Symmetry: C2
Subunit: 345 residues, 2 copies
């Protein structure tokens, strides 16, 4: 199991290391062969190497079997230009490893039910994964323009780009409850008729997984009225991007969520949450999203679905037993990483 580890800025060192603490325990216990190496990335490499993704790191993520990415970003850099700022590097590692699908899981852990905005009965048993196409459509599509008179922008997709994110979706489905929902605007737009027939062709090859289709506006209503009804949701870019932010309010007690970019190269896994500079060093950072991005690596990079679920129970249990300060408890990073480990022994 070869992991290039890029802990990034701010809290990235602290919470990326609590992830590795869970992974070295499973590694010991199951003998998985974890070989990892830490590489420079972000505000720290701007300072050190004079750019956010230096070629040691270009090579490192190019040759590992997984990247464990922390978080970059800091005010310090914003003022200096454009390709010298933490975030540029975030797109450079996406381009290089040819990543085209972004997986975002939302789970509401029975113990933090009361933190959610929805009544308990609507969040019970939410466990779903939205996989959003990453590189196509209206944000990148052309023609585009702006005149004194008007402005234009094209949503455009080719069969290859639809089949790519669709296979990730089905394969992603096989490892959890076997149902895909594709999301489109097929009843009005033709990009969406297209998307619809192609997801349905590709679905033929995955017989063990169920396929259904929904319109973006009906799926926006279902994520608040019945979100426990989905397993994997696959959609385009702007709709994945809108429906993943609406879906991120369902847990409530934010900060807990993991993200993973997948594709031809090396899968990148990271917590959704940035640098949090305010609190780097104090030891209170909540590691729940780094420990769960690790669980996603094990599931998507190495296919060890059964260990990924046992790490997601240890963190569920742990969240119930020792809520971090940010969730009305007092367990900092280490004491929380502890009880996670104390559950998967």
């Amino acid at each position: 199991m070869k992991v290039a580890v890029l802990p990034g800025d701010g809290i990235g060192p602290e919470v990326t290391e609590a992830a590795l603490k869970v992974l070295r325990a499973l590694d010991e216990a199951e003998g998985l062969g974890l070989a990892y190496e830490v590489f420079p990335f972000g505000g720290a490499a701007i300072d050190a190497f004079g750019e956010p993704f230096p070629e040691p790191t270009r090579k490192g993520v190019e040759e590992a079997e997984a990247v464990l990415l922390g978080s970059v970003g800091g005010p310090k850099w914003d003022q200096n230009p454009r390709e010298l700022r933490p975030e540029k590097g975030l797109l450079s590692i996406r381009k290089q490893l040819d990543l085209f699908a972004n997986l975002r899981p939302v789970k509401v852990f029975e113990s933090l039910s009361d933190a959610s905005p929805l009544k308990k009965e609507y969040i019970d048993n939410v466990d779903f994964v939205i996989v959003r196409e990453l590189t196509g459509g209206i944000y990148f599509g052309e023609p585009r323009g702006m005149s004194e008179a008007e402005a234009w922008n094209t949503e455009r997709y080719s069969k290859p780009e639809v089949e790519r994110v669709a296979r990730v979706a089905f394969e992603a489905a096989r490892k959890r409850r076997k149902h895909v929902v594709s999301v489109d605007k097929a009843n009005v737009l033709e990009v969406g008729e297209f998307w619809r027939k192609t997801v349905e062709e590709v679905g033929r090859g995955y017989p063990d997984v169920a396929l259904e289709h929904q319109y973006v506006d009906a799926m926006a209503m279902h994520l608040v009225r019945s979100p426990a009804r989905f397993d994997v949701v696959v959609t385009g870019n702007i709709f994945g991007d809108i429906l993943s932010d609406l879906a991120s309010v369902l847990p409530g007690s934010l900060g807990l969520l993991p993200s993973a970019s997948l594709g031809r190269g090396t899968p990148v896994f990271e917590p959704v949450h940035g640098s949090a500079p305010d609190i780097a060093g104090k030891g209170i950072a909540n590691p729940t999203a780094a420990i769960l991005s690790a669980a996603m690596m094990l599931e998507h990079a190495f296919g060890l679905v059964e260990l990924a679920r046992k790490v997601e129970d240890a963190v569920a249990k742990a969240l119930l037993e020792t809520p971090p300060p940010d969730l009305g408890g007092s367990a900092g990073t280490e004491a929380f990483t502890a009880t996670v480990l104390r559950h998967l022994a």
Copy 2:
């Protein structure tokens, strides 16, 4: 006050008439000069006149100062072709009266708080109006297409189309709490930079009203986390259409919501909810949305903002005192129309 009344099919006769019962009471009481006339529209006119919007009605809505529309649609017609089915007429009256903005208000009435999917604290004091541009952008925009290889669709807006829906928004704002939020994707798409500067030019003329901008994905999260923070929201078509369906789950106890199309011609007002054929004649239909579309007519067609708010209190009070069967009470259309009237005497 000249109203062409088009009660439509199914429950349309019943609930459009309870609206008129409230309006004839205010009319008596304030002497507003209500002159109304009932015209044929929908499944009923397909049967009667052999098309859904016959020229008596074309003329009627053309010459009234407001349309009070009920609901059309019935299975009976679906099988016969395309321009002979209830819904066609719905676009024919939109084209004819040159309507380009659709106003959708969401309010959560303190008494039905427990029906909502959100915890009480998030719905308390929701009162906002989304005005969605109706005739432009990606659903109508061109070029568009579909090949074996790819599919395309253009989101396109010209300054005139952005300024139109923006003035409705500001003027709509003046009559309630004076804050507009425009919703766009300005940080990625140029249609959205355009939309953004134009809503900001037009805002210069309305000094008494506050303007703010938000991205569609951040506004999708705000409608569940803090929806009581908006007064009027103005946006384009597909985003109005997505954000109005997400916003329609906040009341919970559905069926209660009013809609209004505005523009160069005669404003059309209608309940959001269709025909409901299952229950036409039984007398149980909930009239809360027809009585509140009437309140919207008074506010937008005749500018009688102060009476519109007193009819929205009578129906609030009434919802508290006699919930309809559909909201765990037993008050049918008439008994509910009663207590509404019994409050605005």
